[PDB]
Design a protein around this ligand. Sequence first.
Ligand SMILES: CC(=O)N[C@H]1[C@H](O[C@H]2[C@H](O[C@H](C)C(=O)N[C@@H](C)C(=O)N[C@H](CCC(=O)N[C@@H](CCC[C@@H](N)C(=O)O)C(=O)N[C@H](C)C(=O)O)C(=O)O)[C@@H](NC(C)=O)[C@@H]3OC[C@H]2O3)O[C@H](CO)[C@@H](O)[C@@H]1O
Ligand SMILES: *[C@@H]1O[C@H](CO)[C@@H](O)[C@H](O)[C@H]1NC(C)=O
Ligand SMILES: *[C@H]1O[C@@H](CO)[C@@H](O)[C@H](O)[C@H]1NC(C)=O
Lengths: 167, 166
Amino acid sequence: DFVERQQWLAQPPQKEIPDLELPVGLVIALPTNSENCSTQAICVLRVRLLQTYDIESSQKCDIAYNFLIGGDGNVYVGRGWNKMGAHMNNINYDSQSLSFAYIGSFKTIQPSAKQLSVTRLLLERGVKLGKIAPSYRFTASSKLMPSVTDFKADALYASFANWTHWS
Amino acid sequence: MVILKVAEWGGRPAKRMLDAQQLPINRVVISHTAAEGCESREVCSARVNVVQSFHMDSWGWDHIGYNFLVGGDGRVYEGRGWDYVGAHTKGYNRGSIGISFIGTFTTRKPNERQLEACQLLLQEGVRLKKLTTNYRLYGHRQLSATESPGEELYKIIKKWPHWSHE
Ligand SMILES: CC(=O)N[C@H]1[C@H](O[C@H]2[C@H](O[C@H](C)C(=O)N[C@@H](C)C(=O)N[C@H](CCC(=O)N[C@@H](CCC[C@@H](N)C(=O)O)C(=O)N[C@H](C)C(=O)O)C(=O)O)[C@@H](NC(C)=O)[C@@H]3OC[C@H]2O3)O[C@H](CO)[C@@H](O)[C@@H]1O
Ligand SMILES: *[C@@H]1O[C@H](CO)[C@@H](O)[C@H](O)[C@H]1NC(C)=O
Ligand SMILES: *[C@H]1O[C@@H](CO)[C@@H](O)[C@H](O)[C@H]1NC(C)=O
């Protein structure tokens, strides 16, 4: 159910990446704005190509996200539980959160039921491992930075609107 | 020199019959895998299996795309071999041999054993008449829009006698 970096042909990070102070009180949802995927083989393609984009176009040290969730319902390991992401391009947020990126574009298209159910298991695993505070807030990247067009994903965020930890 | 056949590193056969090359070949294209390197038969075999899956399952190609790969253990991992057209350099697969260094060589050099393996592989190709005596060698980036084979690896092969900018 977790696809490790090695399984998606991850490039090793360019330089050292800072550790997060754990546990985090904030988990942030984002779209990848890539094409989506419904099988591990295609999700792997999506994630590996996003890593290149993030490193080579965005000049990040690594894929921008802690975890990525594919339409197949698998969790793709990005920077993982312990390393600071680069999802908000803002050190205040990035140093105090984990990011879950949803593989696809979700302005009008909804995530799959698999994507939503594994998010529950992923959040629970994080709480159990001491990575996420029991009283965490789960929120949309777009709520935090309304002006950022690439964070918009109305159909994704609407899917979490009734969850108890959602803000 | 060790060349491990597809079966010997635990890989799959081609999905269908591949196109054969006219021998001898006088173009070689050096790439890297842009994933993690490896220092042992076990780890390098693992890396090459993942590469094969990426090429056959994620891209949907008929086999691993390289003719050969070179591991940080100093072993050569057979892909399509000398006699078949690869899927490594678009527009240049026919009439070339694609060799990939296992790893990412953007800011780190390939290791002593990896470089030695590649030199021996090329000399073996000339000796067997798979390659011309005056074959031209290129970095992937000269033929395709890419970082491959990585700046540090590219700087090394640019000083090899067969290197060409034509
Ligand atoms: C750090 C780095 O090198 N990054 C590069 C990055 O490198 C990638 C990296 O790419 C490495 C360097 C590589 O060696 N890629 C080769 C396999 C590749 O994709 N080459 C394509 C050609 C593929 C090809 O020829 N496919 C056949 C498929 C044929 C299918 C079937 N007929 C068969 O024979 O099986 C084809 O289209 N042939 C036609 C007929 C032709 O020759 O005109 C090219 O450069 O044009 C990938 N690793 C592997 C192991 O595939 C992985 O995915 C993203 C990253 O990590 O590539 C992107 C472009 O996508 C570049 O912008 C980046 O700078
Ligand atoms: C991926 O996107 C396509 C096109 O919008 C859609 O039809 C398909 O159901 C999506 N696959 C998923 C979410 O698994
Ligand atoms: C909100 O989603 C509904 C379905 O759209 C309900 O099924 C559900 O009770 C609620 N989500 C949960 C379980 O928190």
